[PDB]
Amino acid sequence: SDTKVYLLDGGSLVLDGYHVFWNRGPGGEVRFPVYSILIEHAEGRFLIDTGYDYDHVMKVLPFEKPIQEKHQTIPGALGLLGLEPRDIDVVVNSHFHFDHCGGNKYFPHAKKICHRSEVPQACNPQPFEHLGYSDLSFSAEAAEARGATAQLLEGTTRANSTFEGIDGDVDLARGVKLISTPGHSIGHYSLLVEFPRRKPILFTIDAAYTQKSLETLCQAAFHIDPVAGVNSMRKVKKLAEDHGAELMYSHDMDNFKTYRTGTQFYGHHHHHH
Amino acid sequence: SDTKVYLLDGGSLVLDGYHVFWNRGPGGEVRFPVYSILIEHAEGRFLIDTGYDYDHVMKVLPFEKPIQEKHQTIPGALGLLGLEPRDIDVVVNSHFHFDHCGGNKYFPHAKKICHRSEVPQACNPQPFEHLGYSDLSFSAEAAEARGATAQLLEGTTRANSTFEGIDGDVDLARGVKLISTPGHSIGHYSLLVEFPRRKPILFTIDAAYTQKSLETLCQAAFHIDPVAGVNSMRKVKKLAEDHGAELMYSHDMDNFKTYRTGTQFYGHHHHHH
Ligand SMILES: [Cl-]
Ligand SMILES: [Cl-]
Ligand SMILES: [Zn+2]
Ligand SMILES: [Zn+2]
Ligand SMILES: [Zn+2]
Ligand SMILES: [Zn+2]
Numbered sequence: 001s002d003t004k005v006y007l008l009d010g011g012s013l014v015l016d017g018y019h020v021f022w023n024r025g026p027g028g029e030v031r032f033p034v035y036s037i038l039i040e041h042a043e044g045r046f047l048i049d050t051g052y053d054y055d056h057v058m059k060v061l062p063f064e065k066p067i068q069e070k071h072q073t074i075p076g077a078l079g080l081l082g083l084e085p086r087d088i089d090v091v092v093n094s095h096f097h098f099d100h101c102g103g104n105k106y107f108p109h110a111k112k113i114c115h116r117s118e119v120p121q122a123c124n125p126q127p128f129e130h131l132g133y134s135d136l137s138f139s140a141e142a143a144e145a146r147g148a149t150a151q152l153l154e155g156t157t158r159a160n161s162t163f164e165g166i167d168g169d170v171d172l173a174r175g176v177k178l179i180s181t182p183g184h185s186i187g188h189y190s191l192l193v194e195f196p197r198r199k200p201i202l203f204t205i206d207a208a209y210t211q212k213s214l215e216t217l218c219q220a221a222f223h224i225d226p227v228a229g230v231n232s233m234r235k236v237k238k239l240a241e242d243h244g245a246e247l248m249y250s251h252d253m254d255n256f257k258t259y260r261t262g263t264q265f266y267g268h269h270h271h272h273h
Numbered sequence: 274s275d276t277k278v279y280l281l282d283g284g285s286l287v288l289d290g291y292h293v294f295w296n297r298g299p300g301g302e303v304r305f306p307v308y309s310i311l312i313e314h315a316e317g318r319f320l321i322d323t324g325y326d327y328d329h330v331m332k333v334l335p336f337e338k339p340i341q342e343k344h345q346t347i348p349g350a351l352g353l354l355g356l357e358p359r360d361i362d363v364v365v366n367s368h369f370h371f372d373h374c375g376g377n378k379y380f381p382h383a384k385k386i387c388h389r390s391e392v393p394q395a396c397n398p399q400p401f402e403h404l405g406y407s408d409l410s411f412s413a414e415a416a417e418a419r420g421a422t423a424q425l426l427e428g429t430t431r432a433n434s435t436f437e438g439i440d441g442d443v444d445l446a447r448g449v450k451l452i453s454t455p456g457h458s459i460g461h462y463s464l465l466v467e468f469p470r471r472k473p474i475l476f477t478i479d480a481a482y483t484q485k486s487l488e489t490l491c492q493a494a495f496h497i498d499p500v501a502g503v504n505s506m507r508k509v510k511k512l513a514e515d516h517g518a519e520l521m522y523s524h525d526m527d528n529f530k531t532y533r534t535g536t537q538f539y540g541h542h543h544h545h546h
Contacts, residue, residue, distance in 0.1 A: 016300050018291035023401065023494055027289050027300050127490050127503060128296065217400050221296055221494060230400060 001042055002196050003175060004267040007259055008036040008077035010051030011068030013099065020209055020251070022221040031065075032251035034099050035261070036074065037191060037203055038081075043173040044089035047110075048191055049205070050074050050103030056135045056151070057098070071262075074103030080262050085110075092172060093163075094205040095185040096122045096142075097132040097222070104138035105153040108160035113172070115180070115187025116165030122146070132185070132222055139163070181207035181236060183229030184220060190236060192245060195267050200245035207232045210252035274315055275469050276448060277540040280532055281309040281350035283324030284341030286372065293482055293524070295494040304338075305524035307372050308534070309347065310464060310476055311354075316446040317362035320383075321464055322478070323347050323376030329408045329424070330371070344535075347376030353535050358383075365445060366436075367478040368458040369395045369415075370405040370495070377411035378426040381433035386445070388453070388460025389438030395419070405458070405495055412436070454480035454509060456502030457493060463509060465518060468540050473518035480505045483525035 012033050017025040020032065037048040051074055057066040070076045078084055085106040093101050093114045104112070123145035125133045136143035137151040140158040167187075170178050175194035182188050184206045191203040206222075207229075208214040214237065219229040240247050249255055260266060285306050290298040293305065310321040324347055330339040343349045351357055358379040366374050366387045377385070396418035398406045409416035410424040413431040440460075443451050448467035455461050457479045464476040479495075480502075481487040487510065492502040513520050522528055533539060 016291055016298070018289055018298075018300065018494070019296065023292065023404075025289070025291075027291065126500060128492075128499060131296075219401075221291070224500065225498065226401060227399060227497065 001040075002267060002269065003042070003193065004040040004265050005193055005201065006038040006040065006081060006265045007261045008038055008047075008051065008074065009072055009261040010034040010036060010074070010077065011054075011066060011072040012253075013052065013057065013064040013066055015064065019221045021213065021216075021218050022223070022226070024216070024218050029065075030253075031067075032209070032253055033256040034251065035256070035259075036077070036100075036103070038078075038088075039173070039176060039193065041173050041176065045083075045087055046090045046092060046172060046176065047088045047107070048092045048203070049094055049100040050091065050107075050138075051077075052099040053102030053105075053135055053137065056102055056137070060134050061098070061131065074106055077262075090172075092178065092189075093118065093138070094190070095188045096138060097185065097206070098135035100206070101138040102135050104161070105156060108155060108157075112161070112163040113166060114163045115182075115189060116167050117187040118185070119163055119165065121186050126224060129185075129224065179236070179239060181205075181232035183207070183225045183227070183232045184223045186224055188232070190232075192239065192243065193266075194243075197270050198267065200243050201248055201266060202236065202240045202243070202245040203248050203250075204236055205250045207236055208247075208249055210249050211247070211255055212252075213249070214247070274313075275540060275542065276315070276466065277313040277538050278466055278474065279311040279313065279354060279538045280534045281311055281320075281324065281347065282345055282534040283307040283309060283347070283350065284327075284339060284345040285526075286325065286330065286337040286339055288337065292494045294486065294489075294491050295496070295499070297489070297491050302338075303526075304340075305482070305526055306529040307524065308529070308532075309350070309373075309376070311351075311361075312446070312449060312466065314446050314449065318356075318360055319363045319365060319445060319449065320361045320380070321365045321476070322367055322373040323364065323380075323411075324350075325372040326375030326378075326408055326410065329375055329410070333407050334371070334404065347379055350535075363445075365451065365462075366391065366411070367463070368461045369411060370458065370479070371408035373479070374411040375408050377434070378429060381428060381430075385434070385436040386439060387436045388455075388462060389440050390460040391458070392436055392438065394459050399497060402458075402497065452509070452512060454478075454505035456480070456498045456500070456505045457496045459497055461505070463505075465512065465516065466539075467516075470543050471540065473516050474521055474539060475509065475513045475516070475518040476521050476523075477509055478523045480509055481520075481522055483522050484520070484528055485525075486522070487520070 122142040395415040
């Protein structure tokens with residue numbers, strides 16, 4: 001069956017404008033959305049990222065003032081589509097900052113995929129990365145390494161939280177490509193989805209928070225290598241041009257309000273014939 | 274004659290707390306001092322850094338709300354000591370962000386020294402570095418490369434604005450060591466001054482803006498490589514321990530108010546014998 005993309009609306013968080021636009025700002029509170037990307041594909045149901053865990057943010061990062069209603073948890077968002085976590089075959093994480101892996105705990109049955117460097121980074125991050133990598137409930141191994149086993153959902157084991165590590169640009173499935181875009185994090189991935197009858201979508205994820213971020217090459221203040229970060233923005237600019245792909249950003253409220261979420265999706269049949 | 278250090282008070286600038294403490298903040302306007310370090314040495318008078326140019330900041334970065342009185346320009350500060358720019362034999366720049374090289378224009382006669390990578394960086398900086406490297410009046414070559422020859426003081430030539438490039442930890446003079454501390458910028462240098470009868474001083478310069486910055490390994494948001502930036506903070510922590518050196522920070526108002534400036538200096542005779 002034809003590839004469809006559903007965006008799982010995961011509520012919102014707040015940072016300073018200086019967090020969102022490194023050094024440029026302007027300052028002041030900025031609320032931004034968090035979402036995950038569900039692909040219904042011939043080869044299976046693939047979930048890219050799993051949003052944030054509300055209790056985690058309220059305990060560890062309450063200054064981010066999370067707003068997330070019951071339909072904006074991963075199980076809640078899947079429920080809107082008549083699905084449950086057990087329906088997802090593969091979970092892919094762009095990276096393991098807390099706002100992209102907070103729902104992994106619900107998928108012990110799924111195959112898990114991430115960049116090869118990301119699990120080791122969560123186990124032993126740079127000192128300035130501890131708060132980004134603060135939810136280790138996605139990995140028994142990383143939780144153990146970080147002294148955070150108390151975060152683990154009951155039933156989580158090393159066996160059911162082991163990732164297949166990947167590297168470079170790689171095909172997840174037919175017309176679904178993971179685009180290596182490191183800098184924001186050591187193994188950060190963006191996502192390119194191709195369709196049978198509409199143009200590709202390039203999900204920048206955290207390689208570019210907002211359209212303005214890309215336009216100005218002003219990345220987020222959270223990064224491990226801002227030189228890599230800029231080069232990954234250029235890679236994204238070009239890949240979208242070269243593919244005629246449409247760009248969708250991770251944490252851009254104005255743009256997010258134009259995005260289909262919930263039961264609305266990308267990849268409609270055309271009724272041409 | 275015995276080594277003496279005079280701090281040239283160069284007024285102040287404002288940034289957001291998020292600029293000063295990368296990602297940690299808190300936010301809000303923070304005013305911080307800018308100073309240069311004059312060493313009266315047997316081998317000559319060495320000036321490390323030259324503060325900011327007031328007209329440059331008011332034209333290019335007015336949001337930094339510069340305050341600088343006439344005795345806080347480099348000629349003004351030297352005047353407090355009965356000196357003029359012509360009295361300085363060697364100018365060393367820690368790096369070429371505008372707040373450390375704005376007074377170089379006054380020293381065409383002096384030998385100039387900087388890290389080998391810093392002039393090329395000013396000529397062609399990373400896109401996110403353009404505003405840090407925004408005053409090119411210290412170099413005819415860099416001004417030309419950046420389309421900024423209008424910034425040049427009359428009489429400035431390639432001949433009299435050429436630097437001797439250095440690399441690694443190197444002795445500028447007896448008991449004066451330039452400590453390589455890259456990360457904040459590609460060729461950033463800190464400074465260690467040893468005396469005949471008091472403990473060394475390690476001037477962190479921009480490797481650590483404030484005491485709190487060092488204590489928490491929270492560097493400034495302005496950097497090119499934050500991994501290098503942390504490692505340079507560790508190098509500074511250790512070198513100070515190993516030397517029993519006293520730490521002095523670049524942009525720390527609370528600490529700066531305890532520092533000797535103007536006619537007060539470090540390196541007094543002890544009257545013991
Ligand atoms: Cl569509
Ligand atoms: Cl003294
Ligand atoms: Zn992130
Ligand atoms: Zn994110
Ligand atoms: Zn600097
Ligand atoms: Zn500075």
